[PDB]
């Protein structure tokens, strides 16, 4: 999904069209939820000054920013309170990005900052 013009809600891209159900379809009526499962992740573009990011070739360049969405309910079956999460983002060439956080003791609000 491309969201470079700006958005009132980031989590609204779940309803965004990616494909067509039939050949008779007027608009993209296949939602982003339907293709994001337990084995894959979604890419949402925030900034691209060079226009290097496409669905066929997602190349990240200088000054660009992306959001990676993971269907947590499909992979782990929902993350719970007071649990440790550790992971890595490994490129083919270069140094990896580090993910490490503990989930809050009590979920008090709908959207929470983790790391």
């Amino acid at each position: 999904a491309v969201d470079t013009n700006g958005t009132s809600n980031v989590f609204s891209v779940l309803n965004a069209g990616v494909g067509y159900k039939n050949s008779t379809a007027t608009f993209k009526n296949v939602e982003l939820k339907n293709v994001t499962k337990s084995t894959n992740f979604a890419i949402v573009v925030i900034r691209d000054p060079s226009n290097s990011l496409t669905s066929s070739h997602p190349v990240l360049t200088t000054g660009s920013e992306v959001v990676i969405l993971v269907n947590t309910s499909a992979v782990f079956g929902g993350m719970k309170q007071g649990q440790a999460v550790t992971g890595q983002i490994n490129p083919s060439v270069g140094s990896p990005g580090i993910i490490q956080f503990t989930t809050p003791s009590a979920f008090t609000e709908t959207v929470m900052e983790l790391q």
Binding site: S95, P96, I98, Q100, F101, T102
Partner: peptide, 17 residues
Amino acid sequence: ATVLINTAGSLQQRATS
């Protein structure tokens, strides 16, 4: 070079938390 980067990344998350 790899040792110095990996160690700094490990200490980053601990110090922040």
